[PDB]
C-alpha cells in the first residue's frame, strides 16, 4: 500500500460501481455477484485474477447487450489490468460472441 495499489483497486472498485449501475438492466444482478467476490479477493483470495475474471466477464454481456457506458467500461478495466499485470503480460482476451442465452 506504499506503491499506488490502492488507487488502482479505489478506480477498480469505482468501474465496478459504474458497472452495476449502467448495467444493460437485466444484466446487472450477474454483475453485483462478481463485482462483490472481487471486493473480498482485494485481500481473502487473487484480486488481480479477478480484474482478469471481470474484464473478460464484462465483454461477453457487452456482446451481448451494449447500451454505450458498457463499451466504455471495458476500455477503463483494460487500463487498470496494465498496471495490475505486475511483471504477468496477459490479456488476450478469451474468445466469446453470445454462446447462445
Same mark, same amino acid.
Given at each position: *500500500?506504499?506503491?499506488?495499489? $490502492?488507487?488502482?483497486?479505489?478506480?477498480?472498485?469505482? !468501474? /465496478?460501481?459504474?458497472?452495476?449501475?449502467g448495467?444493460?438492466?437485466?444484466?446487472? @444482478?450477474? !454483475? @453485483?455477484?462478481?463485482? $462483490?467476490?472481487?471486493?473480498?479477493?482485494?485481500?481473502?483470495?487473487?484480486? $488481480?485474477? *479477478?480484474?482478469?475474471?471481470?474484464?473478460?466477464? *464484462?465483454?461477453?454481456?457487452?456482446?451481448?447487450?451494449?447500451?454505450?457506458? *458498457?463499451?466504455?467500461l471495458?476500455?477503463?478495466?483494460?487500463?487498470?489490468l496494465?498496471?495490475?499485470?505486475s511483471?504477468?503480460?496477459?490479456?488476450?482476451? /478469451?474468445?466469446?460472441?453470445?454462446?447462445?442465452?
Amino acid at each position: *500500500m506504499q506503491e499506488e495499489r $490502492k488507487k488502482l483497486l479505489e478506480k477498480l472498485e469505482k !468501474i /465496478l460501481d459504474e458497472v452495476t449501475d449502467g448495467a444493460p438492466d437485466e444484466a446487472r @444482478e450477474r !454483475i @453485483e455477484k462478481l463485482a $462483490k467476490d472481487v471486493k473480498d479477493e482485494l485481500e481473502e483470495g487473487d484480486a $488481480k485474477n *479477478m480484474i482478469e475474471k471481470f474484464r473478460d466477464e *464484462m465483454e461477453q454481456m457487452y456482446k451481448d447487450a451494449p447500451n454505450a457506458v *458498457m463499451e466504455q467500461l471495458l476500455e477503463e478495466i483494460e487500463k487498470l489490468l496494465k498496471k495490475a499485470g505486475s511483471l504477468v503480460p496477459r490479456g488476450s482476451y /478469451l474468445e466469446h460472441h453470445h454462446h447462445h442465452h
